[PDB]
């Protein structure tokens, strides 16, 4: 199936000035372990902030510009190209970002891996609302606050009701 994977704070902030306002190694390691060997799908801003394809993942970028063609990535330019690509999928695919792409794909996704950080940070981009009428928690794992991870957090998995 197709899944969203995202880290957000108490107010659903997912970014500030194209960067993350927090640093949580535990979440980066979780993201890496979960996405390893799988396709990750991201918008242009997300790819740009990363700068290069993530190793061990099949990197996919969704942007319209046909001149945008970073090395080591599949680029999907239209709603038709994205659906056809989605239609052939068999393994779990991860949409990793861009509030815009998260919004565009919410309807074809059946699972959300949400890392909730229990703190508030400056933010200018947010993950959309998760409807209680549409989603329900199927897994919840408290995270470990320590010297490397300065905030309480939790790894949550939602699936459709």
In terms of DSSP H, where are the helices of 10-158?
25-35, 44-50, 79-87, 99-105
Question: Among positive and negative, which fits the CA dihedral 12, 15, 20, 26?
Answer: positive
Cβ atoms 153, 121 nearer than 8 A: no
- Show the domain range for 80: 1-161
**Half-sphere CA count of 120, side-chain side, radius 13 A:** 1
Taking the CB of residue 115, how many other CB atoms lie within 10 A of it? 21
How many angstroms separate the CA atoms of 107 and 41, rounded?
A: 15
When divided into structural domains, the chain yields a total of 1
Expt. technique: X-ray
Q: Regarding beta strands 153-160 and 111-117, do their DSSP bridges make them parallel or antiparallel, or are they unpaired?
A: antiparallel
The enclosing domain of 66 has a CATH number of 3.40.430.10
The DSSP symbol for 50 reads H
Coil, strand or helix: which one is 79?
Answer: helix
């Amino acid at each position: 199936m197709i899944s969203h994977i995202v880290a957000m704070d108490e107010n659903r902030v997912i970014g500030k000035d194209n960067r993350l306002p927090w640093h949580l190694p535990a979440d980066l390691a979780y993201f890496k372990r979960v996405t390893m060997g799988h396709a990750i799908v991201m918008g242009r801003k997300t790819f740009e902030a990363i700068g290069r394809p993530l190793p061990g993942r099949d990197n996919v970028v969704v942007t319209g510009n046909r001149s945008f063609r970073p090395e080591g990535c599949l680029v999907l330019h239209s709603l038709e190209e994205v659906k056809q690509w989605i239609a052939s999928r068999a393994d779990e695919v991860f949409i990793i970002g861009g509030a815009e792409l998260f919004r565009a794909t919410m309807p074809i996704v059946d699972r959300l891996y949400v890392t909730k950080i229990f703190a508030s940070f400056p933010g200018d981009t947010f993950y959309p609302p998760i409807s209680d009428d549409e989603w329900e928690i199927v897994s919840y794992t408290p995270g470990g606050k320590d010297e490397k991870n300065p905030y309480e957090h939790a790894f949550i998995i939602y699936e459709r009701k």
